[PDB]
Symmetry: D2
Subunit: 113 residues, 4 copies
């Protein structure tokens, strides 16, 4: 259900493998490819509710470093129109005095199509 390629409304793509142990591993997109890691409920309830998950990307790679990281929190909904609904937080490293403006909040939805 979760393993495979997902597309965000804006162009971004993520490729992920969901292990039997509750692990998420993959990449977020060559100068713009980045490593991701996360966890998920490997035994969800059967009564129709979604499957909880989360993952992180640090924005550094062989070609650039933005000195920041994003975390996504949300749930997988199965079916014909499968989707992953998230909210995210983006934190940048800052000095002592600019800490208050260090974190962005947003949201996103991913589909298979």
């Amino acid at each position: 259900g979760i393993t495979g390629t997902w597309y965000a409304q804006l162009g971004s793509t993520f490729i992920v493998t969901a292990g039997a142990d509750g692990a998420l591993t993959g990449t977020y997109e060559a100068e713009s490819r980045y490593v991701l890691t996360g966890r998920y409920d490997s035994a969800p309830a059967t009564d129709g509710s979604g499957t909880a998950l989360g993952w992180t990307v640090a924005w550094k790679n062989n070609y650039r470093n933005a000195h920041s990281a994003t975390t996504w929190s949300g749930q997988y909904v199965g079916g014909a129109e499968a989707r992953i609904n998230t909210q995210w937080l983006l934190t940048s490293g800052t000095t002592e005095a600019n800490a208050w403006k260090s974190t962005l909040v947003g949201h996103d939805t991913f589909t298979k199509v």
Copy 2:
């Protein structure tokens, strides 16, 4: 700097290893111990700003399953009074109609002491 044991203001403890590759691995606390995974800026700026990081915990283990997950986003600040400042999002798996009440937001600070 980041490897080691951290304590949250409320009692929670987390033990983490920061790899050379930008990886975070460890545990969050036996019936209450859980696996965590994340990423961090392995080459931060030198001008005094903090080090960006994030991690995820799925709330399932050999003893219980709360059908949910938490993600933490924030930064490490070094020195004599080292600390990690975060904001977090907690998502539970829900039905279609209760999705709107699915996600909590909060914050936390961790110290070495």
Copy 3:
């Protein structure tokens, strides 16, 4: 531009008056009608960016009291397909020990249609 009736994707409706002073006043929907109050940028930039605003609703009225309140933060975008894009926080009054689970985060978009 902002004065008038707005509809949320789920059925909710809000009626608002934007004063010359930067004030927002109106109602959010008879047992389910509630008073709202807010503020907005009464002199936005001309270069195409949106108009910042925010408002609050306390969930008490002559017929019920849910001991909570929601605040919306976002921006107005003008044109043929005018819209207001927000993120919101919902806080409930809690005891000392359950404070950590006191606040929900979500998002919403409103249209004229």
Copy 4:
């Protein structure tokens, strides 16, 4: 309980009047003084839980305009060490393409002292 002067951990001050109707009116601090408006639970539960409230400030005044607004969501806790605990969202007006980076999230605590 709520009427009066409150001080944030960083220097900011806010002066507010809580009406019998569930209204909040006041100012947030002369070139740096701004109008605020909000709402609160005028009949909270008696079992010890806090009193839910929210307010908004638009960052424009006779001396400057930052084309943005902040909303605060949280609760009042009474007693000898009275306090107001909040989380806030700050939205700036942006173009179509920079919308994703438009909103900051943070937190704050206010005291009487």
